[PDB]
Enzyme design. Structure first.
Site, mmCIF file in Angstrom:
data_model
loop_
_atom_site.group_PDB
_atom_site.id
_atom_site.type_symbol
_atom_site.label_atom_id
_atom_site.label_comp_id
_atom_site.label_asym_id
_atom_site.label_seq_id
_atom_site.Cartn_x
_atom_site.Cartn_y
_atom_site.Cartn_z
ATOM 1 C CB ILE A 67 -1.354 -0.215 0.833
ATOM 2 C CG1 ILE A 67 -1.606 0.968 0.882
ATOM 3 C CG2 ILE A 67 -0.059 0.465 2.174
ATOM 4 C CD1 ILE A 67 -3.281 0.776 1.617
ATOM 5 C CG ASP A 68 1.683 3.615 2.446
ATOM 6 O OD1 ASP A 68 2.264 4.399 1.993
ATOM 7 O OD2 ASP A 68 0.886 2.998 3.269
#
EC number: 3.2.2.27
Lengths: 218, 370
Positions: A67-68
């Protein structure tokens, strides 16, 4: 290999053909957001972001959704690092070497393994923190993910709580399965097997396994 | 949230999924329960030879829903008019559209939304009957209710006795014909194939049951006192149709270049539209000439037609012939019992083709070693 010029940095978008059913709107969603994004320095720098849309979609067999981006000096390649300094790639190589059998290894980067798409869900973030740009990228992401999920028949999300609802954020009953952050504590890659199920539902869909060894550097 | 247990369950699914064809009972019941569990966790778990024109589109539209186990075609007028397929979950509403997208003949789907299950009457079928415009003779008015895998079938009709006077052929396609029963009252009557005609015991100058319907009228099956054995019928009709047609499949066909066609086939050579072209192609082919030389016109002109080995002889030894220049000009069978054998009548109906190819191979063999 097509290109479009956009309103703000980096002013250029070089997309592979597999990404052409979406690039049309990705420009639309970008010009009205970038003017805010670039008010502050970010990592990976603006000259990155879309690096991984020149890659094909037909050669791909699984995608890995982190996600990042890296909060400190990323490269636009998910989990990537030139001197094996960051924790995510560290623990990933660890729990892969654990099953492959070789544990003497130079470095690692998940990109060259054939069949895997290393993917961010938020394409950048401020320096030193995380999820600080979720207000900008949301529909961009939603769109990239709808596109990418009908090419690849698997989904492994990293994150126990963040990918909590994405079943409803996708409208095709793809084989979506959730995992845990290995860079996280309680030693979550110690309590979950994350692979050895990949080339299993890659079996029951009558398809070739994943070559987990090629990502090692020597 | 993913453990080893799920791994074990899916491993058993893996192992017995393609042993499902003939597994043992516990495996099939376990599979019924594990398709159950995995679907919420793993999301994946009297017709005859139809030639390929239809089987390709069949192979495509069977990919539309894996509940599809077969497709149901009505063969009519040398056309495969699909009406539905045996699907388990997919209503055929997409299926006839698909089959239209893949080159399958579909009917005029004029389906009245039925609320209360009912059977159609005078208008209730008549009006749809006009709206249909079936250049194909399909008489079953069936309505699919969506929400089921069955149908509601309506059809009403009469039957009477018609006086046949004679029997005919009628070209329907390329070199293909059908029988149109001609009645003493100037009307024509339809049938499905040759064997429908046979089964009927159809002859001349008598009355027979016919099922009369408004848009089509079809020669009714037989029900009477049958003392006239099958072979007699076969012989009669084979003569009546004429000496220029043999029986290919469900239909007729004129004898013609198809002889040269099959022959060129059997000897691994190019197509030759005329006979001298043939003799040339043979003559330049030393191997083909040299593999004719050892043979007889009879064995060769029967191998080019695939008659098995022997019962051919029980046929041949049952007729008398007429030859000049070592060349058949006439023949006639005199004992009719053998036709009552199935493997025999398939050879008998297919004879005039053999006669013609025989004369041809005689001629080429004469002129070649001439």
């Amino acid at each position: 290999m097509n290109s479009v010029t956009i309103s703000h940095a980096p002013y250029t978008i070089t997309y592979h053909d597999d990404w052409e059913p979406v690039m049309s709107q990705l420009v639309e969603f970008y010009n009205e957001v970038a003017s805010w994004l670039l008010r502050d320095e970010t990592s990976p720098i603006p000259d990155k972001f879309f690096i991984q849309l020149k890659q094909p979609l037909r050669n791909k067999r699984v995608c890995v959704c982190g996600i990042d981006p890296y909060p400190k000096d990323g490269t636009g390649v998910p989990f990537e690092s030139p001197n094996f300094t960051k924790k995510s790639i560290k623990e990933i190589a660890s729990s892969i070497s654990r099953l492959t059998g070789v544990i003497d290894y130079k470095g690692y980067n998940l990109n060259i393994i054939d069949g895997v798409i290393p993917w961010n869900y938020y394409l950048s973030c401020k320096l030193g923190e995380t999820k600080s740009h979720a207000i900008y990228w949301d529909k961009i992401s939603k769109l990239l993910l709808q596109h990418i999920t009908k090419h690849v028949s698997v989904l492994y999300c990293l994150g126990k709580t963040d990918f909590s609802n994405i079943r409803a954020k996708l409208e095709s009953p793809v084989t979506t399965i959730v995992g845990y952050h290995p860079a996280a504590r309680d030693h979550q890659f110690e309590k979950d097997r994350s692979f050895e199920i990949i080339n299993v539902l890659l079996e029951l869909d009558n398809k070739t396994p994943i070559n987990w060894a090629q990502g090692f550097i020597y | 949230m993913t453990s080893s247990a799920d791994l074990t369950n899916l491993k058993e699914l893996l192992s017995l999924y393609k042993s499902l064809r003939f597994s043992d009972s516990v495996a099939i019941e376990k599979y019924n329960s594990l398709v159950e569990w995995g679907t919420s966790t793993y999301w994946k778990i009297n017709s005859f030879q139809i030639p390929d024109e239809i089987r390709s589109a069949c192979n495509k539209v069977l990919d539309s829903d894996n509940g599809i186990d077969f497709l149901r075609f009505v063969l009519l007028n040398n056309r495969w008019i699909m009406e539905d397929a045996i699907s388990k979950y997919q209503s055929p509403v997409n299926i006839f559209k698909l089959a239209s997208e893949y080159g399958l003949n579909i009917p005029n789907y004029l389906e009245i939304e039925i609320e209360e299950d009912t059977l159609f009457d005078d208008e209730l079928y008549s009006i749809m009957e006009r709206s249909f415009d079936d250049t194909f003779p399909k008489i079953s008015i069936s309505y699919i209710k969506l929400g089921e895998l069955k149908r509601q079938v309506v059809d009403f009709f009469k039957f009477s006795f018609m006086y046949i006077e004679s029997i005919k052929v009628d070209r329907i396609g390329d070199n293909i014909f059908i029988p149109s029963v001609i009645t003493k009252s100037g009307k024509k009557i339809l049938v499905k194939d040759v064997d429908h005609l046979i089964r009927s015991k159809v002859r001349e100058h008598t009355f027979v049951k016919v099922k009369k319907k408004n848009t089509f009228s079809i020669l009714y099956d037989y029900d009477g006192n049958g003392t006239e054995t099958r072979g007699e019928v076969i012989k009669r009709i084979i003569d009546t149709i004429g000496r220029d047609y043999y029986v290919n499949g469900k239909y007729f066909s004129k004898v013609g270049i198809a002889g040269l066609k099959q022959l060129t086939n059997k000897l691994d050579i190019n197509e030759c539209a005329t006979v001298d072209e043939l003799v040339d192609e043979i003559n330049k082919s030393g191997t083909v000439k040299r593999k004719i030389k050892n043979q007889s016109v009879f064995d060769l002109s029967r191998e080019c037609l695939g008659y098995p080995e022997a019962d051919f002889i029980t046929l041949v030894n049952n007729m008398r012939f007429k030859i000049e220049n070592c060349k058949v000009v006439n023949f006639n069978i005199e004992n009719t019992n053998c036709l009552n054998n199935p493997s025999i009548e398939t050879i008998y109906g297919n004879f005039n083709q053999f006669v013609s190819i025989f004369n041809t191979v005689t001629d080429v063999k004469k002129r070649l070693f001439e």
